[model samples]
Target chain A: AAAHHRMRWRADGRSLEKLPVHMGLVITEVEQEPSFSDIASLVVWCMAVGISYISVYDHQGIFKRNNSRLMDEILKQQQELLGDKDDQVLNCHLAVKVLSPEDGKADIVRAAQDFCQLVAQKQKRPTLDVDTLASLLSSNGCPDPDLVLKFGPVDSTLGFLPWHIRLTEIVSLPSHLNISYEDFFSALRQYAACEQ
Target chain B: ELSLWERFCANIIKAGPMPKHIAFIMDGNRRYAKKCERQEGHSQGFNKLAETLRWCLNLGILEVTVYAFSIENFKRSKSEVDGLMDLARQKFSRLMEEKEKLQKHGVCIRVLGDLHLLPLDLQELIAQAVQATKNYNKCFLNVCFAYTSRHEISNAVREMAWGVEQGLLDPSDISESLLDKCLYTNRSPHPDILIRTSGEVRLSDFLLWQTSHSCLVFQPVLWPEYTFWNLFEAILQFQMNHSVLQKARDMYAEERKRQQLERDQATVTEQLLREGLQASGDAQLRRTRLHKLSARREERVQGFLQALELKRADWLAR
Candidate 1:
């Protein structure tokens, strides 16, 4: 069993020639209540594969509403998947954020309002450039994602962070419910194969 | 013209739901050229675009937007940039020569991006094409030349900030809809499907703000090699995903309405507070004031949009 586990781990590690600095997981079209354990497992797999930043987004804000429960499940997943045997190799810090529809255009609107207010108060010039606007909208401090794994029949981002997805390579999966490591690694492999 | 089999396939697909507006990220012409051991393939890419448009028209899609050039693309070798500029000049001149066809088809041509950065002759050709087709409404072709979503969004922000500085708009009046109105793509609804060719899954900064709810399709076929079946497959994907996309759109509309109500109420309450009145306790009075404020805000937004339109027209005329 231990040997099998190591083989599985080494295979996944060898498959990825490159890793996205930050990856976005978008879940849409929830026909059945998506399993939290499935999502947690995906997160753990991403962490195990050495992706540092992960974001899980749903249009209806389900994951954001259950952020704590999801985090707990991810911790449980890590314990089960890595445990004490492979803890040393898989000991990497992961930053995970749960995003909702509000985090998309609403953030842009807020930043615009702030810019207008600053202009009105004479704190900022009325000439709002892209750099200034980008800085204002990125208050969450998460780097823009390099790859996005969109899981559902819906082909839309459905209002994922509008400002941050510029150059983000979004790969679609059929569903995240009972998603496997093979499918996950395959998506990463596709991303790795593509040129900018 | 479509072959018989192609028309049959298109008709079958047309029986299902169709996208009224489609956008494309046309990538990999140069790469295709490299693979074929050719120096340049942009001319073939342009021809493919014209062919694709014919396919779209046959499939009953009325509007098409193409990412023709990006601002970041200027960072490429000067020779390539010059080649692109020359190709654009040739194309726009040909478009002008085909003015009668454009007019007969009622096709509107809009170039979306910062025009001042382009060369004088190319800009002139673009201006002429835009002016000639300004009145057409039957079909629309928006070429995103020298464009990026960040640049577009920043331009919108600048316009809003200018409105605030001129006291035409209060900071409280700025909303997503307001920003949307101020964007280059305010004339069109959000794209139904955004397709990026050459197998690239990245948006590459094309229409980021406008495509929030757009069905994004990343196909592996190079732009020069894209076929009718590829486009048909994209439409098929859209048809299958239509129900969920519609639900998301409805949710967005509901959310927008809710946010607008909350923003309007807060704006009215803040005004009342500033005027040193206890209007919070009087629901009827607050409602009346809110109605007035909403009307005033709408008028101001319309006025700002008109001014912007006039400025754009004047620039084009120049």
Candidate 2:
């Protein structure tokens, strides 16, 4: 937890330039519950890097309350800390939920039915075109996460944000506790270097 | 070295976001077995699976899926296939026996794939394990046996076709999720990261549809030799690419929306034209030109028909 004591700051200007302007951070853990400080730290880091949108999700909806509350606090604290520079902070929309497989299925199924009803004609089969399907899956304005961090020994994402993050770059860290800023920045640097 | 390593991992946890689902393409078990002069390599592969699940649970990963067997593997020699079946039967039976342990951890075991292709004994054993963990909602372990993404997709396509034929499904209702529901993996989300062992760079037809957005990691280590360190490195790889991957997804969705809107606008214009409510000057000119050409063609056709009729009359008179 010594890593917790360091002053939380945003990534440098150069670093921000390298990042996806609308970045998403997906964290998969054994449990969805993350500490306020941890959530705050990540969110603050996102703000520093100018990430326009950030979402924290657990497969089972474990961290919804903690994340929502943390966002409120982080947004408040950043304004307080930055004072006149508050406008510099990116007004990123934050969504925290248990984004289960069931949610994805419901969205796709509902949208498909809606689309089919709109376009289907006599003697013409309703085509579930890719563009239509993509729009349907685009819910809550949640873009696909650019990077998904898998914490733990397993080499799989249990199925978090299954619908949104098709082209996401995923990096796995060992765990979520006591993560160093250096390690965090290194992950970002790796993202910047990726050709995609 | 061990404690230091442990500390290093702990620091990584504080580093950034975590992946929600991870898929494993465990490969090279047979090669490893051959290298070790063993009869088959699956025994060690099975051992690795069990160990990996425990590690995932301990590290707080709630979902894990492994490529246990593919449908293509069934084409191997009878003996190899039998050996694999026997090993599967034994491992599933072992999972059944460990129900209480699984329950304690709240780990739900799901065997994903074409189960009908497997031996009845193994199928029964798999069913027992699935049933036992049916109540657990926290963690999941999906074992893909007799599975291939193509088979899964084909199954979905066939089911949708049947639905269409039966008048139950509209062609419009044929969607990604509708197709997903037909696959054995409908229960799980797309894997965030997919790690293939034994240095293979290809997906090998596993999770083809689902991994469209997954960050892939190819580990040089064989399946049996995969260790926690390899997993750590792979996770590190995922962490680095997370943001870019997300940005790409957003761009893709945005582009798709734009294209759909354009298509919708063109269709609306065509609809107006067909209704004769809104016609452009160019279209009006083209329509008249088409009518004039058609009338000339119609005259020629009439003349030919009349000529044919007269010829028939002449023949009769003659």
Candidate 3:
């Protein structure tokens, strides 16, 4: 917290009421595979912050497969952090997915077309409206990310979930290598400060 | 002398991997105009835009889409709207005059928006520019006027609906490819980089669909003052992420190839199942499992199907 002399946190580092951020952390520039412990730390940090459903992404779907093994570590950490809070339930969910450009588009179209087939069976054309198509495309009801953190030099989402992120504020960090707790927390601060 | 330095910068950028398409949201025109005289900001912005378009070619970028006007821009004060319209008229008229110069650069100019909503003269001006460049297939310059992503996406859907109404397209024929084909930028690749000036972090309803994986660069410099340095810095950033970008592109292509093979395998399996269910016995399923299916898991599926077909044959014999 004290290390962020660049933006000068204004004595309001973590005091901002948790800032109501639904974050989508995009780790695009993976020069080499990110270590399992690094990902565990990311998951543990999100759990500690009580984020509402974080979506972790990597380009090649490697993260999705590798991180499944370390969920036990995260659960153990969460338990220690929330000791004696057995009555409460964990509200946060993490979806690690490989979101290619053509990933959901065809799947949505196929679903809609299937519905259209059903309608055609009833001797009528399909009602292909905006709402119908949108619902058909709702693969996961993952809300539009309010804050998208791109952990690479690429300022763009590199075609992350194009359909959903219409108004997301994209913040690009220099690197994810040994990402500091302060850096992660400061990004939250940055998201909290966006006027949009 | 300045041109020499600009060439040097462009040469350096040319050596690196360049984006196929770059989109711009030229923000802060009104604010820039507030500081300068009436309409001065927009006029300056237009000049800078022309410069950047040429710079794209110099830096090896092939296509550009600019947020020239938005549908919501009409909501401004009457005088300002008229002023903007007047500016558009003037610009388009100049574009008509400069058609030969543009053609010489092999630049194909296009207008992507609700042109029917524009004034008759402006529409004619746009038509002339587009028609003149209709055959120029080398480079593209898309000016998004009176545009919104919602309108574009809906229009794409509406076109599909129109096809359905005309009985030319089946409901099941609707697909992502269909929607993409109906979009204005169907011929151009999805933008690889999106640059917004005046440091506005929001998309402000421009090219929302195209932002799928575009590198979004928001610069604090106003649109009027946008320079080669700003662009070069963005290019440098693009270069920094060049390897990752290349990996993603290669990965997607590889994924597509893999998917296509799976599709072929599925169709083969489907045909085998259909043949098996016909007057014949479990012969087709057995053949498919033994000879055709390549993937280890799908082979297992084919084996399961063969077993089921054998069971069905035994039941029929009984």
Candidate 4:
């Protein structure tokens, strides 16, 4: 309650026209240590903004490796921001995922191998169409991301969900170590201004 | 000559690390045409492509790929589709007229997509262009016609499945490297940067797999109005982030090597165990089998690529 009020005030007390259903945040470079608290803050902000899903990616899988730590930080931030209200009360039901390189091209190859195995077993025909493969790859069950905010000096996605970024609008930020609310809000503003 | 300023800017950009390959999603031609109240927006788009290629050539960028057409674009109105096909035919014919110059410049032209889906005459023309410059290796131009990344990936999957069914490829051999060999862009390196014009931030299903680690720049300038400054800015952005991108690429390369070694070692150990050979004196045998396995995998991919090319040639013949 208090945190939401503060965030809304920080956002200039104006509502955004549109928000992506799923937003991806990719941190390209990491130093001696990554700021887990800052990452959690960003995720909480996304949740507050009513984004349904948020995916965080890094080439080295730092977040995926430290997923439990990240989750702890996220819960801590959530408690601080929204008070004791349940997620339903706040209307901010966000599904968060942490991705590494293994979740990118390798996932597609594994699905192809599975298809080959099915064909070899004579249980299925050798027809591997796009939809079938897409379903196989969607084992993660997340919709394709509408926008990806990449943070760090590197300008690439660094192999973040290659199959799902077909229509993703990627915006680059310098770093996520201490990203401000204004920077994050303006990215959404830019996305809203663009036509599909 | 106005080349002075351009050369000066090129030199400044060249002072940093350069990208060998860059891809483009040339968007917004239709909107540009409507904005200008002109019917020849596509023509201007084509002209911009030629000009951009010239700029790339000046910067010593050896490889360039463009999304010439998408398979999904077929859903547009019939007249618009026909107009695009006509434009492609005219440009390709003009390319044929400049075969000598293309040959002189050693520009190897490659059309990367499902050629069978195209009109037969246009396919014939593309085949001619591809075949004419197939041997040149100095520079390369890749045009994705009737293509989508998902389709390309699905095609690779089908081929790998077929290989398994035919007893040619072991199911365990189905890996990222093997799949890479089966893609249409197998011959070229992954793009270093992907630039989409007209402020369209979406990839629109263009080179989704190959650009997994590419620097993406979505500029607001329309394709037909794309200028040298826009190209330079993209290159400048690439240069600014060159070192970090290179580090990521290196990490991926090392990871791939480790995976390959692990797979080979596992295979060698399994073979040794099955043959009831002692681990003490079987080092030579393990090495020999690993070498043979590696060579066989390479040969399998080459054979599959050759067969695919042959099938495509048959389609052109028909």
Candidate 5:
């Protein structure tokens, strides 16, 4: 992340430099926060997830390459992972679900690791093992993404494994660091006390 | 009977007739953090991006390969790296409990990357995850922890070299098809459609051979902001581009047959000159420029061929 990128300036400094000057001097007025990860706010983040309401832009612009590749699958599965559409980019299917915390996080991560191992063995593409992926994950599953909870609707999917995320309860919440314990516990208690 | 992910699942229903493999670049981590910045900085944004991964699963995508941590990212400041480590530790610790959830949902999680690069405990946890999910056959999810695509392709090449040494694979019989089946993605379905979040357009060497013909979607949204809609939109876009892909393939096939006949005639003509020699691979014909051939033309031709990693001299020969 630290390879120094050469900074260039436009003859007129059109985009970035002008932001503080033209947009309201917010940079000058706002004070920056000191370092703190607020571990407690993310305590049970394993349970939170995103809920997307999909809508696409200019359907006329969507191409047919990806959809056509799956023509065979659409024929077989007949679900939605297949279909033909132009100028259309399906937007609702990408929402993430938080994996529920379980007892076999190690096993799961290891399995993920082993799978990557076999993959690494066979194709050897940017391979991974279990230990590396576990280190990247927070606990057993990914904690509630602070970005999603603190700021609703974020765009990046960093720090998440392609393995542990799908098929968990995906909840979207406001950006409050300290979700009210009463409400939060109430939910947790309900979940814990509920039927397996 | 459309489920929540039916629209998204449409891409997976028939196991992908055209593209069996797809690679996702998973771009825009910091940018997403910027979008999510509040009184707090971008950590929350970064964390939320992690959550968006599960969204990808709900879409019925069987094999999803991501570029998680790169070997080069160790260059960041200590505090930043430490914080990321902390977040990772927490997530891994929590996932053990998440297994039941995954099984209930019929999703199997696999971490794909170089785990030797990470610390020990994290490594052990990864092992456990793999073991636990061995039986879940419904869905496959691959997490790229510390991975690089270039490294992967080279590694696969090395493996093949080893196989040849061991007399397991015949060099002449080892086609791209055989090579592809043994890749790291062999355990899971190859990525059918690769979506790179955060507007970045580089593949970072991900899913090399498997992704040659895969569709790519670059969404401007950061990983955290990646929503079901973002995925659905990607799928819809894939559908639109799919038909065009089929058309192009058809055209290419027609051209290929015509070229084959010409090659045959050329071979027969040569046979008359020299009675009993057979040419194979590239010995049959050398590439000849029928029209405007220059350094520029060669560069362009080579560039496309390289991008597709295609050896086209044989086909282009007249």
Candidate 6:
């Protein structure tokens, strides 16, 4: 086996014990241990793999973004509950669409205006009319694909998205941000060292 | 038309505050028509559902989720799937054809589940309907096309993981609210009530997470037999208990006050007598409050429910 510096093979990493975890083969010395385990000790997964839940931690971080997100606006929107210029625009758009179903025309300024106006009201708060999202959260639901890479506070994750994101963790690392390859690898290494 | 809904909603409103969001399992379409001896049996079910939505709107429901199709059903007999696909296509196309739909009804259209599994044309139309009607806020119409609750949950997890990866959301900052915003039903609230026709008891995993605490309303009537009136009565049934919940709240409040009074006035016998008087007073207060609430709201709600032509006994039962 080649000397893989970033990943290290551990005796416990491939065990059939508790949670599922992957290995970080950071480096391999002369005559490294093999990846084989006893049949009785193998954790059989529901799917084809004999492991409990196999996940690729993206140690090498083969992530590339074709387009950049407007991080400033995104952050700004995330801070406030009901008010953000960009989000407010969306809210106004939503309010108009919901309140006036028959009105053929919509004024953009009016939408912005309504959003600003509605946010000022005591009744308006960031609310969800759909229950699954609420229930999913109420029961420690899974996060969106974007939240997969960093750490999560909750233990359990609920399944979401029928078409695009299913089973696989699609993590995004924006290059424009002042992030390090080492830090990223360290996080990946931790994830690999955790469980199968 | 308004009266039909008013009669139905009257019953529902009187039932008191109920589930905010509701989902429907529209089964026994052909069976209902067969029993009713009517043509286009499934269409009858769809039409009745449309009316049911109006009744729900009157009931002040936040969201209405419906299982229009299932992924398993798509694998059924070719003609049956084809027929359903065609039916759904027609309904969806018509929904889009009316541009005024978004503006007039405040009824947004979201085709939940794996809609891409359907034909490409339907997918495009569904996307368009979703986009066009995304702004509609009056009441929501969630039509599950190629949806299953389990698969839907699986998809949501993928998104949640993705959300963490994107760095747009802090994983430490992750909360229940953050998770809900990512699900298929993220745009709206969970179905507070789930209405499945044909007397079915099973969820079929439809809106599974969303219906965790929802009241399940399974009318004996099949999907086609499910009418706007039935929806109204359901609302009425929900509304009738408003007084009860209100009384419960009142009892807690009264006890709180009595404890405070007891501490202020150190007399056990006097406190007991005062408590008795308070109980009677609470009962009278609840009745008076109920009467005041009902007198102003009952007429409008009654008219709405009756117009729907659903049963009155359902709410009366409640």
lDDT of 1 by residue, A32-76 (tens): 878899898887888767777898898888898898888878877
Output the better candidate (2/5) by TM-score: 2
| Index of the highest-DockQ prediction | 1
Q: What is each candidate's DockQ, to 2 decimals?
A: 0.75, 0.05, 0.38, 0.72, 0.02, 0.01
iRMSD (Å), candidate 4:
1.1
**Range of the 10 consecutive residues with the lowest summed lDDT in candidate 3 chain A:** A1-10
True contacts kept of each: 0.96, 0.07, 0.48, 0.88, 0.00, 0.00
Lowest lDDT 10-residue stretch of candidate 6 chain B? B308-317
| Model 2: residue B42 alpha-carbon error in angstroms | 1.6
Worst 10 residues of 6 chain A by lDDT: A97-106
TM-score of each: 0.91, 0.53, 0.77, 0.88, 0.46, 0.45
Native-interface RMSD of candidate 1: 1.0
- Candidate 6: stretches off by over 4 Å: A1-196, B4-15, B33-39, B58-62, B169-174, B240-318
Off by over 4 Å in 3: A1-14, A17-21, A40-50, A84-90, A94-132, A139-142, B72-79, B97-105, B116-121, B157-179, B208-211, B274-318
Model 1 residue B279 CA deviation (Å) reads: 6.7
Ranking of all predicted structures according to TM-score, beginning with the best and ending with the worst? 1, 4, 3, 2, 5, 6
Candidate 1 stretches with Cα past 4 Å from truth are A1-15, A79-94, B34-40, B267-283
lDDT of 3 by residue, B177-245 (tens): 556666777667888788888866877767776665566678999888888888877777777756766
TM-score of chain A as modeled in candidate 4 = 0.87
The local lDDT score (0 to 100) that residue B95 gets in candidate 6 is 80
- TM-score per model for chain B alone? 0.94, 0.78, 0.78, 0.88, 0.66, 0.67
Superposed Cα deviation of residue B44, candidate 5 (Å): 3.9
- Give the Å error, residue B259, model 3: 1.9
Q: How would you encode candidate 1's per-residue C-alpha lDDT over B1-318 as one tens digit per residue?
A: 898999998888888788999999999888887645232598889999999999998888989999999999999878888889988998898899887887788789999998889999988999888988888888999999999999999999888898888888888778888999988888888899999888566888899988888887878899999899899888888888788888888988897799779877887788788878777555678878888888888888878888878877898786
Relative to the true structure, candidate 3 reaches a TM of: 0.77
- What C-alpha RMSD separates each model from the true structure? 3.5, 19.7, 10.9, 3.6, 22.4, 22.9
Candidate 4 CAPRI classification by DockQ? medium
Q: Which ten contiguous residues of candidate 2 chain B have the minimum total lDDT?
A: B309-318
TM-scores of chain A across the candidates, in order, are: 0.87, 0.71, 0.71, 0.87, 0.26, 0.19
Candidate 4 lDDT over A117-180, as tens digits, reads 9888988677677878888885456789889998877777788888898878888888888888
